[PDB]
Structures are given as structure tokens and as C-alpha cells.
Amino acid sequence: DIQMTQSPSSLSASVGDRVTITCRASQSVSSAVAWYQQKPGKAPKLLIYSASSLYSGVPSRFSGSRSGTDFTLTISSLQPEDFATYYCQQSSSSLITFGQGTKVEIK
């Protein structure tokens, strides 16, 4: 199927600096990439869909973009509520797969 390789595996940062998480696809995933945020013990939450569209209610600090096959999630001003694990998910085909995750912690 399609592998989503999400890098880095983990990250430590402060409050206010830009956080960028990258996800690459095995083959062409035509802008069908969505980003999720999960906190320990809680169900995942939707942040981005169509690789650039902000889901309703999500703060404007979160941003996404695609350049061909690779995808990036950007948090412009990191805030204490943002420390969690982030996943990239593709739904180009009927067999939909996730990335391995990325844990954002305190520097």
C-alpha cells in the first residue's frame, strides 16, 4: 500500500517558536492528507484536511502545505496546549494508512 514516513520521530521545543513536522508518501497521494493531534489517554483530534485546510475550531496557529509528495504541519506559535503526538493520515485509496507519529515536548 502507501507508507507515510513522518519525521522527526520526536521533538523538543519551547513556547513561541515554529514547529514543522514533515510527512512523505510512498507514491502519489493527491492532496488527500490529514493531520491529527492525540494526547495520552484521549481520542485523536482533527487539525488539517486536504493538506492545507483548517478544520473548524482549530486555531490559526496550525498550518499545512504540500510540495508534490511531501507534506508539512506547521505550528507558528507553539503553546502549552500543543504538546502532544501528531499523525499524518492519507485517504487517497480505500485502504487508508497513518504515519508513525511525532511527539512534541518541552525543550
Place this chain on the structure above:
Amino acid sequence: TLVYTGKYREDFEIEVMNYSIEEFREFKTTDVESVLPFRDSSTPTWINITGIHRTDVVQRVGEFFGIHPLVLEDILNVHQRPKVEFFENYVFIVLKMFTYDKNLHELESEQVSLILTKNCVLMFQEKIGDVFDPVRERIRYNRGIIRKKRADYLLYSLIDALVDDYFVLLEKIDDEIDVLEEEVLERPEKETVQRTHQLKRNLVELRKTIWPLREVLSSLYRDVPPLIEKETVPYFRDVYDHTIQIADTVETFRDIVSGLLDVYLSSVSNKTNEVMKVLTIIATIFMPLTFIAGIYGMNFEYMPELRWKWGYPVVLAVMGVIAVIMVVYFKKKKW
């Protein structure tokens, strides 16, 4: 006689796939006479000929099955467009494959000719490699109702495989357009204009190919010939809808690339002005200075500046003076 127009003559083989509700039985041979007598088999027979450049075998095969020599002309007529022709004992369809390369953005095409007959379907291909491996899997491993239906369902399955490959090609073209959008709007680059030209050309080829396929599918289901049968009309109608869905994306992509070209070519005159400004700046501040050097570089005796108050530093300071006045002259009126 029969003449082949294409440019693929390196290989040739014949692949056969008979099947029934009970069992399936496949061949990969090289002799035309071996595959010849499958016409009268009550079970569906799928015939694949990987080399049509060998005009002898493609001439031999059509004589037995009873296909008019005009379709023989068309099968080896590589330079064609998709089309479908109905006949009393068979129906003749011509389709196009498409091979794309990400590293080298050229859209290669291979022509496939389909002859649906009674309980037998003939395939004619130029090179090795096709899009029908999933159909082979369904035939081999009973993966669907393809085993329970007749040759019309096989024609469905093959046309569906072709449109699936078209969807994959669309995915690759979409990736290329996504990259080129930023590579053109954000920055100017010498390679990008040629890349945009190639993308436009490939989209033109896709548009010239896709609409005949849409008309072919509409002919297949809308006006029913006896071969297709009534049960298979919904399937061909679904394929027709898929073709609509491909064509709309092709139009959208063409509009996007046309907009990119329009912007780039609209941004040309001031670029010409800037290059001329650079060249004029360079020439204005150096040609008179070279003249100043040359005029004191003449082989003239009794010239006043022998050692008059450090003549060489005086000349160099003069050079600096004209350089400064020339550079400030441009900045005042902003070239």
C-alpha cells in the same frame, strides 16, 4: 498488404487465457496455429499478441476469425486515435495506454486494439507490458464474477483496467502540476518554462485521447449491439462516468497550466527593461574609462603628463571621479 507504423519491434509473444465456471487454462506460446482453434470454444477465451509488428501473424489471425481487412489496416496503424466500430460478427475497439516518467516528463503511448467476437476476445499490443494484471488475477483466482460471465464482461474488465491506469496517470500529472505551481509562481527558472511547455503538451495529448474514449464508451452502452448483451450495459455506463471524471480533471489541469504560461509571458517587458538597464549601466561606466586609459596609453612623445604631480595617481583619481559621477547620475534618475 499490411504495414506496421510504430517503432516497437524488439519482442513478440502470444498469451492465452481461457476460463469457465469450472476451471481456467492458460498458455504462453509463439505459434499462430496453436492459438488458432480457440474461436469455437464455448468457454470464454482471452487472446493476447504482444507483437503486432510481425505483420505475418497479425495477417494470419484475422483471416480465420473473419475480420474485414480495414480493421487489419487499423490494427497496425499505430498513429491513430481511439475509435470503435461495430460489425455483424464482431466489434472493433482501439484504445491507448500511457506510460509516464517522473524523472523525464514525457508521455509515452502504446496502442491496443480489441476485437470482441462470439465467446472470444482478441488483443493486439505493440510492446511488452500492459494494465491487465488485475484482470489476470481475477481470472486465475476467482476474485469476482468475471468467471461467471461471458466475453462482454471480459471487454468490460479490460476497458476498466485501462481507465484505472488513466486515473494513476492523472495522479502523477497532479503531482507534477503541484510542484510546477510553486516552481513558477515563487521563483523564475530557466528549466521551468520548458517544463511548463512540456506539461501543456502532455495535457494536450491527454485531452486529444480522452474524449474519443468517452465517445467510444457512450457508443458501447447507449446504442447496444447484440454482442454486448443487456446485463453489461450498467457496467459500461459506469466506465463512461469514469471517463467523464477523467476528462473534467484534464480540462482543469489545462486551464491551470495555461494560467501559469500567461503570467510568465505577461512578465517579460519589464525584464527586458531591467536587462537593458544593467547593460547600459555597465557600458556607461567603463567605455569612457577605457578611453581614458587608452588616450594616455598612446605612443606619443612630449606628452605633458610625464611626471606632472604623480601623473599615474592623478589619472587614477580622475578615473574614480568619472566613475563616481556616472554611478550617482544613474541613481538620481533611478536606472
Place this chain on the structure above:
Amino acid sequence: MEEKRLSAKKGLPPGTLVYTGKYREDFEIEVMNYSIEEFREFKTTDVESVLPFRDSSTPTWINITGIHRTDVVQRVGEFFGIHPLVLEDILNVHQRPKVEFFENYVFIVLKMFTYDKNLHELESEQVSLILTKNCVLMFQEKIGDVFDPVRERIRYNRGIIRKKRADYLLYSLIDALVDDYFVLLEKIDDEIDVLEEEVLERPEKETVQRTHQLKRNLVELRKTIWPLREVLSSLYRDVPPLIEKETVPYFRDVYDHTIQIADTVETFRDIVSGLLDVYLSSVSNKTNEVMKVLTIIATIFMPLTFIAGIYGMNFEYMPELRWKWGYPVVLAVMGVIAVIMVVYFKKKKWL
């Protein structure tokens, strides 16, 4: 032509209706029930408190805002017996204005054009209308429309809307939508004037980009206006059973208005096309000035450099020992040549 079937798309389950669009923030249902004497209105979130308006006597206006709620659209269409292809067309915004006549309702696709001053972006939004026997069904994407004057007319019994039936409500909605195009086409006017002033003063690439955005926007406006005029013409010269005979002149007036809509957009198109050539003339004039500078410099200083090289060659025999060693004479020759070139340039008015 066809039998009005579902599209049976790929990579998508067969019974699926999909909202084709970008707006997923707002959902509201505004019902506006009125008669000659009575009047009421209420916002709603659940659809089930709106279905009992299908069977009624007063003319009702049901305004569903937010079509990304495909469940609400399907529920409404099922209650009102609307063909699933019609719901698919409601949910598909990538289409031109349409008008379809059915045995029990009319289905009109229209477009609203909000234009913003900054970034000069032309934004579009599909609005869909279904006229049933007593109910007009409206589907939108976002909050914000052009139907506030109609709302005030019902709320204050102004006009004559409350005396007539749902046909007049449909006419009022279409009339307000068409009249907003006049606001759009008078907004574009001052922007064209500003572009003209800028191209008279400051030629840059941003002006080119602005002018080409104008051209693309006007092409899209034409592609939206022409099907709109055809839709109004069909609403006029077809007399469906649902629209009474006394509503036809109003639709005629709407068609008339669309006429000068298109006429003035054509005039704006060719005037900005003229601005383009004004731009090219100005930039070519600037390049002419700079090229004159370069060619004057070259014309003066190629021959003088050549003469300096000639008198600066190193041969065994030289003309040095004559004409008072001719060095000031040679310099005077160079000066005379330069003066002749300069006056010749000034003779031809060469800046």
C-alpha cells in the same frame, strides 16, 4: 438525452453524495412563513422542525445555510420527494447556472459574487432554489447573502410580496440576486480608474498582475452571466405550471436587466484591454530612453577608442615627428568628432 441517474463515481461508494466545496464552518436553517395577515420566522438547527412546512397553505421560505451537512440536504430532498440527481447537483458547486423543469418543482442554480477590495479576489458561492407548490427551498454555503431587502419587505409588509404566492417569492429572490451584479459591476469601475491612474504614473509588474486578474475575473463573470441570462429566458418563455401567468412580466424585467449587466461588463473588458497597450507603450518609451543613452555612449566612444588604439599602436615607423607632434591636434580631432556626434544627435531631437 438521459434518464437522470446518479453519476457512479470512482473511489467513492455508489450511494454517496458529496459536498463539493470549501466552506464547512456555518450551518443554520432560517424559516420565514408569511401570509396576507400573519407572519412568523425562526432560526433552527434541527431539520425535523422544518419538514412540516412541505404541506401548507401560506408561502414559506426555507433557507438552509451550510450544505456540507449532506445529511440535512438528503433528508429535506427525501421529505420533499426531490430527485437524488438534483441533490447531487445541489451539492456540486463546480457548475454553471442551470434551470431544470420537473413535474412538481423547478430547480435553479445561481451564483453570488462577493468582491473584496484588497487582493482583488472574485469569490463565488452557489445558491440553489427549489420552488415547490407552496415552499421555496434555498440552499447556501456560507452566512451572508443579498436577500435582506426581501426579508425586510416581508417583515414590514412593504411592497406587494405578501399578497402573492411562492412564484413572486422566487421572482424576488432571483431579482435581488441579479441586482447585486450591478453593485459588483459598479465596484469594478473605480478599480479600473485606479489602474488607469497607476499605469499613467507607475509602470511595474504588479500592474501587469492586477490587469490580468481583472481579465480573468471578467472572463469568469461572462461565463456566469450568459447561462444566467439563458436561465431567465427559459423561466420567461416556457410558462411552467408552477409559475402563474401574472409573474411572467417580472421575469421579463429581470432578463432586461441582465442585458445591460452584460453590456457594461463588455465595455469594462475592452477598456482594460486598452489599459494594457497603454502600459506597453509606457514601458517601451522608458526602454527607448535607456537605449538612447546606451547608443549615444557607444556611438561617441567606439570611434574615439579606435583612434586612441591606432595612434597608440607600436610600429617601427610613426607619424609622431610632424605637425607639431600632433598630440594636442589629435585630442582636438577627438573633441571635434565627439561634438559633431553630439550635435547630430541633438539635430534629430535625440533627447
Place this chain on the structure above:
Amino acid sequence: TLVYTGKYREDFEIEVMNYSIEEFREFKTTDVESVLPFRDSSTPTWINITGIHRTDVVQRVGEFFGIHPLVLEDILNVHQRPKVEFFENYVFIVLKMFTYDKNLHELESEQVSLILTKNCVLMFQEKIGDVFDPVRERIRYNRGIIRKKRADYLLYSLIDALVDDYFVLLEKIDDEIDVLEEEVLERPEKETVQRTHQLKRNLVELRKTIWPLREVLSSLYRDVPPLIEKETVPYFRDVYDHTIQIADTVETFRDIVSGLLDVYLSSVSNKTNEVMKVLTIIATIFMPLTFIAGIYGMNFEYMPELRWKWGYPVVLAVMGVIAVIMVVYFKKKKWL
């Protein structure tokens, strides 16, 4: 009734005019208490409300005559398109007047609207200064058919005066087109683009003003008002003919001005070519020559240029002949 744009604010005056063969009357006032001359209907009534700055006079005259307050804002509002209305008790028409300044290419648009009741021509102005004085001169000299008609001739006379003003203004525009034409053809300059585009936009605004006026007069003439006595319908048609002539002249002016700009662009793009010719000729003649002058400046020690009838005039002659042959090679191509 109070709301209006009225970009010009100054003193307000009112002039009336009642005339006949037997008696001659003319009065001036600053206020409209003189309601007795109105509604008499015995003789034609013409009053020139020279100003709309104060809305009270318009409101009062609307109270006295037919009002229909929906159009009071229209008559007050200068920014309103030329239209026509057929309300009862009068006829409502909206027109415009233009004044051209050659020195400063701007065309002022002072809105003028006429309402005509039963044997009373209510004539509303916007500013002091009219092109309507031919009619007053005709009345004072007591000539023409102005006296005998039943107040349906004054509307035609005023519209004819307005159309004559339109003729003279398009004549002035014709003069302007001719002068910019000669400017573009023989003596181009930098700001000629500004003049041409100002003329173009003026022509666009005049088209937008006159085009609706043609169908306003079409509705007025083909759909005759009930108050017209039908004795001089041919004059009410000659007005329409003059309007269509004005529209055609505006269209042809727009065409001519559109062509002039492209003539200018061709001018500048041929100037580019002449500059390029000069630069290429000079560079290509003198660059090989300076290369030879710089290569024969090679100092070294062993130079085979010694003697051979002296190399100085040999190299000078070969430079001259190569320059001449290059020039004549450019002579056949007619570059220079």
C-alpha cells in the same frame, strides 16, 4: 426631498417667463410665493428654477403641482441616469448638460430634469449659466411658432437647444481628435498617451450618457405622451434623429481615438528599431577595427611588421577598406 448631492453650492435665483402675441411678461424672483402665474393655463408658462441648492422651494412646488414624492429625490439627486417617467399630472424626463474646457480636459455633467404639467413647463436647473438662451432670444424677438402653440412646443424647443449644445461639443471633440492625430503622426511625445486616454475616457462617459438618451427619446416619440397635441410630431422625431446622429458620431470618435493609440505604439516601436540600427552599425564597424588596433599594439620583440613599405599605412588602408566593405554590405540591406 431634502436628500440630494448638489456638488455646486451658491446663490439661488428663480426666473419665470410667460409670453403671447398680445402681451409680453417676464419676472424674476428669489422665492416662489408667486404661485398665481402657475395653473392659469391661459398662456404658456415657463419658469427657470436656477438652482436646486435649497430643497424647500422644490418641495413647495411639488406640493402645489403634482408631487409623487418618490421622484423628488430623483430630481434633487444629480447622480441619476437619464430616464423617463409617465406619472399622472405631468411627464418626468431626466437629461444632462455638458460643458467642455479645452485647456483642462474635463467634462462637467450638470443633471437637468424637466416636468411638464397641463399647459405649464416646470423647468428645473442645477447651476447658473445656461445654453438655453436661444429660446429666450427667440421669445424676446417675438419670432417663430413659439407663441401659437399650446405649451407642447417649449419642451421640443428646450430639447433642441440641448441637442444643439451636444452638436457643438462633439464639434470641439472633433477638433481635439484632429490635433492629437497630428501630434501622434508627426510630433509624438511622452504625455500624448495621457491626452489620448483622457479623450478615450471622456468619450466613454459621453457614450454612457447619450446611449440611454436615445431610447428615452425613442420611448417619448414612438410611445407618444397623452399630453402631446400631435401638431408637431415631426419635430419630436427630428429630435430623435439628431440623437441617433450624436450616437453615431460618438461611436466613430471612439473608433478613431482607439486607432490613434496603436499608431503611437507603432511610432515608439519603430523608434526602438532606429536606435538598435544605430547601435549595431557603430559597434560592428568599430569593434573589429579596435581589435586590430589592440592586437597590433602587441609589444613583444620579434614583429614581422617592419618595413614592407611600412606597416602603418598598410594597416590603416586595410582598416579603411574593411570598414567600407562592411558599410556597403549594410547598404544592400538598406540599414544605413
Place this chain on the structure above:
Amino acid sequence: MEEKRLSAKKGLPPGTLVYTGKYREDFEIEVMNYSIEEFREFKTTDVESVLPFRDSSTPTWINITGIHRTDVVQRVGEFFGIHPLVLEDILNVHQRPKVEFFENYVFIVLKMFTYDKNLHELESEQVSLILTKNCVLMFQEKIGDVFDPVRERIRYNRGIIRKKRADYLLYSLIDALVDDYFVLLEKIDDEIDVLEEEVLERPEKETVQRTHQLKRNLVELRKTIWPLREVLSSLYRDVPPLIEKETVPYFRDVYDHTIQIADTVETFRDIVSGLLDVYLSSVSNKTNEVMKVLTIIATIFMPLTFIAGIYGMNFEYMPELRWKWGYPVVLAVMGVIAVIMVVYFKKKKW
């Protein structure tokens, strides 16, 4: 001769049909008196067989191919009761498509275009259809139709053309013409595509007249399309008694087809308009190529020759003179200047 010169049509007494066309070499009549169970075909070159079908109860399709003969059209018109002021309308090729209703028949004038690919020119053939009583009278100037599928459906039952009356035959012919218009539009699209490639990649001198010929052909095409929609609207919106009222949806579909054709023509016109303006930009880009080349070379070499001259001019007591290491230092400095110019120009922007 031709169209720019107008020496024809000048001196001729009225009362006689005059041929305004250019083809006077092919005359042929083909008749299909088809019915619900039978169809009769009779390829003829004589008028006599045509007449007895005027009062036939079954549908009849008279096709007079070649109208250069005055007497043939005269006899047909007076036999079928066509008004005299209409015969010259059949005989007038220059006038635009139109429809003129009448009490017992309908007069329809259309045009059919064939596009030559070897020489990009549009040719038009006048066609006149008269739906009188139970027969359809069609007049042409040359052999070669777009109604071959209609003929096949008449001969071979591929539809309901047989079981209907003559108005359905008229609808079938109109639909055939509209389909051929779609085919014409496809060929024109191919021509515009190849022209756009020509403009975009390689500009030559001969492309500009091709662009103007394409624009002129599109203008003529649009001018012909405009009245066709009006004719179709007059056909279905207010159906005369000669139309069975069971064929309204068919003409309505043809009207939709005409709408689509007009949209395609408008898009083609816009593209053709943009072609020359983008040709100018393409030539300017080709100019800018050599612009940049010359700019790089001049910037590399003028400062270098300036420095060579200043260190190479001759007068006594040069401070740099009498130094052994000056020459390698000078060459190193010149190379550094050259490489910094190269990296500034070609490596990052040009």
C-alpha cells in the same frame, strides 16, 4: 467574380429566378417516400417523378441537389404552392439563416460548413428546407451531405424515424446539421491547438496571417451561429400547427446543442484573440535570451579590459612597475572579478 468584386447581380430583369451561388455543375434529385413498413428510393435527374408525391399520405423526403436550373425550382415552387418571393430566397446564398412561417408550410434556411485542413479556410453551402404538408423539400447546391445517417435510419430501422410524420424528419435533418457543427468545432479546436503550439514555441513570419485567418473564420462562424439559435427557438417555443407538438422536446434538445456550440465558439474566439498578444511576448522572450547572453559577456569583459588598459598604458615611473609579482597578482584579481561576475549573473538569477 468572388466576393470583394461585385460585378455580378447588377443588370437582370426581375420575375425570373437568378442563381447567386458559385456551383453550376451537379444536378440530382433523390426521393425517399418512406412509410411505416416500406421505403421507396428513386435516384433521378428529372422533375417529373418528384411531382406525384405532393399529396402522398406517407412521409416523403425530396432532395434537389443542384439549384442552378431556374425552371426546376420554378416548377417545384408553383406545384407545391410556394410564394414567388421565396424562390429567390432558396436561390440566395449570401443571406443569413432564417425561418419564415406560413399558413401551410414552414421555410427554413441553414448553412453547412466544411473545413479544409490543407488550407485553413471555411466553406459554406446553402441549404433550404421546406416542410409543406407531408413532405420535406430540401434544396442544395452541390453533392455531399451530413444527412447520410438519416438516410441509413430510413433504409435500415435504427430508430423511430419511420413511424413518425414529416416534422420528425425535419427535426432529424436539423439535428444532423448541428452534429456536423460539433464535428466542425472539434476540427477547429485541433487547428487552434496546433496554432497555439506554433505561437508558443517557435515564432515565424507566416504565423500572424494564420492567426488572423482563424479569427476571421471564427467571426463568420459566430455570425452564422447567432441566428441558428433564434431559428430553433422559433421552431419549438411557438410551434405552428405544422408541428405535431410531440416533437417539442427534440427541438428543445437541438436548442441546447446550439447553446453549447455558441459557448465553444466564444471560448475559441477568446483564445484566438489572445494568440497574437502572446506571440509578441514570445518574440520578446526570444529577444531576452540573446539579451542576457550579451549582458553576461559585456559585464565579464569590459571591466577586465579597463583594468588591462590602465595597467598597460605607457608613461614613466609607474608605482606598480619594477615589481616581479605584479603579473600573477593582476591575473588572479581579474580571475576573481570574472568568477564573482559569473556567480552573480549565471549561477543564481540568469
Place this chain on the structure above:
Amino acid sequence: KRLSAKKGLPPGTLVYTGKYREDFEIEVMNYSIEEFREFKTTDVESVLPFRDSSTPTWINITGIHRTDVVQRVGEFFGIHPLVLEDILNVHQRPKVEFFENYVFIVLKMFTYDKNLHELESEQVSLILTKNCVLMFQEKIGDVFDPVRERIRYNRGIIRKKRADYLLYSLIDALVDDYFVLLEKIDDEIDVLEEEVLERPEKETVQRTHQLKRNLVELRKTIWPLREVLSSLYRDVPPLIEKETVPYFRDVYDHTIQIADTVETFRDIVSGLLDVYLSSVSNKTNEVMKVLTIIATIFMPLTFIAGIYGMNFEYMPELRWKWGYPVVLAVMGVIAVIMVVYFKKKKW
């Protein structure tokens, strides 16, 4: 200067706004089935007795510069002041006016000089009253001689019919003149096309503008002609008789055809300037290519000469081993390696 009579007295003025006053002659052609009569006289009253004949007559008034004679002629016929003032002024768009007693028709002439490429117009008037027609001309000379020849030698049916056929003959002669004018202009368009394709000059833009204004004036004169004949046919004035309408149908169709022809001429004139601009741009590209090739060949050679030509006492190339031929060979190699770069990219 035009538009002088509009300011002043609306009801009517009697002034001739023409530039011709040289000649003043009268031509009268009283004709019937069996009679033949022609004469030339300068007497104003000499034409009065001939108007009372029931047979149709054609009175020609060339060089209408005397206002008194025109006023007298109009007064005898009771000419309306509007028609009387419209006769005199030259710069009036062609418009047909029908009245109870007579019909007023005004058109324009045209002649072309090949050398000066100039278009000039002369105004003529058509007034049909009782059984006579009035001809008013701006000067001597006209293209109406085919009608005179057909009257003289009894050709066609003009002898049998009334003055309506005479009016149609006059209109036909005018349309023939117009067709000849457009045929002449076609030759100029063709030669301009050839010249602009194979020899552009600075004069071509002025030529194109002058031709454009010529065609604009021709269109502004021909469209009212079409409107005049359209009103003449459809409005069916009482004075025109039967057995005449098909002629007017023919002339109306001919006017539509000439309008189409002048529209085609307009499009060709529009395209000529675009072809010219394309040619100029291609020439500029060529000239820059030549300049760049010369510069890129010769600047590095000058640099090479200058480097080794410096005033250095420590140059090894000064007597290294016959260094001058060596550096000549190096420069030749440089020149050839640069020139082979060209002709590969087509420069």
C-alpha cells in the same frame, strides 16, 4: 466646419455650405414613349413650362451655388422649409423624407484619385413631385451618364415606365458608382498588403491611418444609404407605384452586400497593422542577434590582446618562442570555438 446652422434660428435657414461655385448649368430631359427632347439653357424660368407636361421629365440643376434660384424653384413647388434648408447644406447624412405631395431623398457621390489616396464626396438630391424629378449637384461632372444614354438611344423599359423607374435608374447608377469605388479600393488594399509583407517603411503607418479614415468615412456614408433604401421599400410611400418594388428589393440587397464588403475591408485594414508590428519585432530580434554575435566574438579577443599588451617587463610571452603567431593561433581558436557555438542554436 459644420454645425453652424444649428445655432441661431431652428425653423430654417437658406445657406449653401459648399466649396464649389464655378459652374451653373441646367439640364432637362422631357421624355415619353414616342417623344424625344433635350436642351441646355441658363434661364431659370425656361424649365417652368416643361414641368406641366404629363410626360415624365428629369430636371438637372448642376452647381447649386445661387440661393435665389433654389428658393424660387422650391417656392414654385411649395417646398417645406425643412426640405428647402436640407437641400442647401452639404454635410447632411443621407435620409429619405416622404411627404403628402412629394418625397425628399438625399444621397452622396464619391470619387477616388489613385495618386493621392484621397476620398471626396459630393451631395445630390432626389425630389419626386407630380411627375417630375429634381436633380441638384455640387459641381459639373457626374457618373449618371448610363441613364442619359439609355434615355437617348431607347434601351430597356425606362421609356415605357413613369418617373419612378427614372428614380430607380438614378439609384442604380449611384450604387454602380459605389461598387466601382470599392473595386478600386481593393487594389490599394492588395498593394498595401504586398508592400507591408515585403517592404516595411515609416510611411506605412500614415498610409494605414489614412486608409482607415477613408473606410470610416465610406462606412458613415454607406450605412445611411442602406437605411434610406430600407425606409423607401418598407414604408411604401404613396407616390411610388406598383411594378417597381422588386427593383428596390434588388438595390436594398446590393446595399447589404456592399456593407458586408466594406466590413471585410475594415477587418483587412485592421490586420495589416498587426502584420506590420510582427515584422518590425522580428527585424529587431535579428538586428540584436547580429550585434550580440559581433560583440561576443570580438570583446574577448580585445581582452586577450590587452592582457599581453600591458607594460610589464616580466612577460615570458615576450620572446617565449615566437609568441605573436602563437597568440594569433590562440585567438583564431577562440574565434572558431565561439562561432561554432552559433549556427547550432540558429543565431
Place this chain on the structure above:
Amino acid sequence: EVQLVESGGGLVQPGGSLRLSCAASGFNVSYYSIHWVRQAPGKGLEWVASISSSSGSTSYADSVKGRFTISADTSKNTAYLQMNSLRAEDTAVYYCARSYWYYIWSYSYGNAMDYWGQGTLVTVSS
């Protein structure tokens, strides 16, 4: 108001079976697709199966295909996951999600998951 609730999760012997019940309230499962996503302790999310109730379309991951079974109940407005031939590597927290389709291009569609359930923990050991 719109919510998803999971049940059935528990401790099951290897080679065993259990059914997971996804109780949906606030919406109709006919109009939306329902997904099953699991998460092993310490490892990331992994997509198991999907059901389009109205059309009956079902898709499975290879790790569970032919071994799991997704189903829908329009009357009960609930979706089920059946887990057969269970391995110890199927132990995880099982989430129920709801997704909508959105439009990118004509040929291309994507879906995103709005709401989730708190999940049920399935243990397969001993």
C-alpha cells in the same frame, strides 16, 4: 450532541472472538462512513476497517482482512466490528470514528475523521 460510544472490549483468549458495538448518537450512520482504528500500547494508530452503511461498501486492512468483519445496523444506528481468529498482536485500544468525503479534483477524493469515541481496550493473552 453528535457522539460515538464503543463497547465489547475485554480480555479474550488467543484464537478467540468478540464483537465490538459502536453506539452512534446525534447523527444517522446511513449518511456517513464509520471507521475502526486501533492503537497498540505505546505504538501509533492503525486503520482496521470501514463501512458505508447505505451502500454496504466495506474495506479492511491486510492485517485483519478475512479475519475481521465490519457491519452496520440502520435500525439501531450502530456499527459493529467482529474479531475472529484473534492473535495476541491484535491487543489494542479500538476507536470508532466518523468521516466525511471532500473534493480535491474531479478524479480525486479524500476523507477526514471528525469525531471519535473514547475507545475500548481489547486484551488477548494467557
